[PDB]
Write a protein that binds this DNA or RNA. Structure first.
Lengths: 88, 129, 218
RNA sequence: CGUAAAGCGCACGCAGGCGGUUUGUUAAGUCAGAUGUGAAAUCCCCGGGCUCAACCUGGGAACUGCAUCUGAUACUGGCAAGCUUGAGUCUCGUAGAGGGGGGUAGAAUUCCAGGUGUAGCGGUGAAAUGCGUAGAGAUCUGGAGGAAUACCGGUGGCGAAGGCGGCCCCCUGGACGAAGACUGACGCUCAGGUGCGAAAGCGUGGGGAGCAAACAGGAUUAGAUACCCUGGUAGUCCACGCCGUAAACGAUGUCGACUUGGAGGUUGUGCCCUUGAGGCGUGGCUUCCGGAGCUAACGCGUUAAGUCGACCGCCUGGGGAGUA
């Protein structure tokens, strides 16, 4: 699980208004940080299929959130992917 | 998920008249209020009421002429998977006129007989009998 | 009134949702019978029993519960009432044509029961004779004075006499019945609530149904 | 489409299908009217002519269709602005054999060495093969190795399914709850596609204590290529790859809503008399009985096989055959 201090840091970084933990950029950034940490986990632990199912659930949730943000506001989507570093 | 709130409305009405509920409480909409107006005008229900401004809640007070219910049958005709649009000479009669067919026409939602008097067609919301 | 509503409900589990319009629910989950719903159906029931007694029809009240049937069999018989008290034989109203053979047997065994044919062959015929007389009297009772096809039918407990209300529904006879929480009120033409097991409740209800039915109209 | 044929073994998802609620609009669908057309002949409805009828023929109707012109949003579809009630995120906690890696512990089986001790042990319905007269079995001591974790243990718990049971640590997935905040339809299902997927089996390298296909011996039997016994190899165990099937079942696909009840289990929480594993509510997950209803019946029955809605998969008599 992502730590409370780490989630607070990402919420404060990606929220242009205070207490914006539910916004699409904050959710996508939280999911991206957990995905990078789990890639570091699964490199040491292959064959963890039960945790990889939760990883794929988080990947699908992040992709659907990014699709919604791309449909809603393309400038916010481009700014988020250019400060996160994904979808080349 | 929920795709047909109108079918959920008629489903709740049918389950209430089967379970002898006096009133059915559910979320509402403009189409739900229109169908409740048609049912109240034709006498299949007693009353309908909207409560609340944040979450509009519809209450229908079901009526019973006997121990049995008033509505003998209620079915959804136009579905999200299949919408039925019929013209003024093609919209049907339920029970050879003893029932009604709630139809959404170009000027409003009303009885099939009222739509035939108005000379308009549309999609049949439901069959009431 | 102060006479009704004192009787409280028992058997707090396995009640009926059809009964649930008649329970208070107070006294920590004990199903108390509501007085204001008990009384008006009771008043209308006695109005319609006054209507039946105006026709001079048969009332046919039945009670077969333990420690109450001995009160039922004697207390509610003023002059012309008709009772069933114990060992309620199934299907009496539906095949009363062939129960008429048994009641003619009861009439013939009651005729010359204290003299003559049953006194000859003093003991060996007579012990089987007395056992047959007492079992047939226990089985029928007031049916011999009833004479078949009653106008109304009164029931002291719908759950215990669910068979009786079923064949009364089959024959179209109106049913006046006191029910409990566990009993079904759907098949009863005139449902009144109360406690079936209570000796006080059964005695006061029997006195109430014996009241103003003795005379009918005239 | 539980049992007659039929729900993919399970899940994630592209296209596609459908989509909560409020306010503005050309109207694309849709609706209404009109026009152009939809050849004539042939079905249809009123008439005539053949002596009647078939047959011919006058007019109308019909050709349910396709284009063009005019209208508001009643609904669906697009655009614009919203809302939270669907979905999700954060704070604080709770239970759990959920998964991956490592370490360790205790019974017990087997083997080796040794001490005591003698003529049987083992096995079966009976025996016999087998072990033991080179000392078995039995008892005790020390050592070695592998596998599974007695009790707790449960009509318990977790996981999408397969499945997961000693203890401890590390990494990690999911679920649930009081309360508050946030985003604002971001949702449901998903043919192809991808991933997971018991046991048996296959490849390479290890390990191998019990168990044990194959194999051998002895029984049984008329025969016994078996059931039984005595052994016993692959395998069962570990690492990395395949295989992708099961009576993979709840023979019941997933999501959402509504619909009488009772008895328990498990797991959170609010109040009461802080005095108790005592009382009253609200959630989740579950076990059994049962009302209406449904069903051919058995039965299912708020976790439906009841009442509907969205989407996908499958069936069209048995055998041949899930075969070529």
């Amino acid at each position: 699980s992502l730590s409370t201090e780490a989630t607070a840091k990402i919420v404060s970084e990606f929220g242009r208004d205070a207490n914006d933990t539910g916004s699409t950029e904050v959710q996508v950034a939280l999911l991206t940080a957990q995905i990078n940490h789990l890639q570091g986990h699964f490199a040491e632990h292959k064959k963890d299929h039960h945790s990889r199912r939760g990883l794929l659930r988080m990947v699908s949730q992040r992709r659907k959130l990014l699709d919604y943000l791309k449909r809603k506001d393309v400038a916010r989507y481009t700014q988020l992917i250019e400060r996160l570093g994904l979808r080349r | 998920s929920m795709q047909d709130p109108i079918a959920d409305m008629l489903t709740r009405i049918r389950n209430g008249q089967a379970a002898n509920k006096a009133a059915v409480t559910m979320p509402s909409s403009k189409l739900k209020v229109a169908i409740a107006n048609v049912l109240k005008e034709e006498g299949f229900i007693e009353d309908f009421k909207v409560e609340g401004d944040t979450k509009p809640e519809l209450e229908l007070t079901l009526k019973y002429f006997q121990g049995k219910a008033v509505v003998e049958s209620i079915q959804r005709v136009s579905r999200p998977g299949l919408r039925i649009y019929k013209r003024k000479d093609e919209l049907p009669k339920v029970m050879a006129g003893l029932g009604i067919a709630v139809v959404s026409t170009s000027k409003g939602v009303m009885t099939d007989r009222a739509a035939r008097q108005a000379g308009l067609g549309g999609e049949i919301i439901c069959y009431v009998a | 009134m102060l006479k009704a509503g004192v009787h409280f409900g028992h058997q707090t589990r396995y009640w009926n949702p059809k009964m649930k319009p008649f329970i208070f629910g107070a006294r920590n989950k004990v199903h108390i019978i509501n007085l204001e719903k008990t009384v008006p159906m009771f008043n209308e029931a006695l109005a319609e029993l006054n209507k039946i007694a105006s026709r001079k029809g048969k009332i046919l009240f039945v009670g077969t519960k333990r420690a109450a049937s001995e009160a039922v069999k004697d207390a509610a018989l003023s002059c012309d009432q008709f009772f069933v008290n114990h060992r309620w034989l199934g299907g009496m109203l539906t095949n009363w044509k062939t129960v008429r053979q048994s009641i003619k047997r009861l009439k013939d065994l009651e005729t010359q029961s204290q003299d003559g044919t049953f006194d000859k062959l003093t003991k060996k015929e007579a012990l089987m004779r007395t056992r047959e007389l007492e079992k047939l009297e226990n089985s029928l009772g007031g049916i011999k004075d009833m004479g078949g096809l009653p106008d109304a039918l009164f029931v002291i407990d719908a759950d215990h006499e669910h068979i009786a209300i079923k064949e009364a529904n089959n024959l179209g006879i109106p049913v006046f019945a006191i029910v409990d929480t566990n009993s079904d009120p759907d098949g009863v033409d005139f449902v009144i609530p109360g406690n079936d097991d209570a000796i006080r409740a059964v005695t006061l209800y029997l006195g109430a149904v014996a009241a103003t039915v003795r005379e009918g109209r005239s």
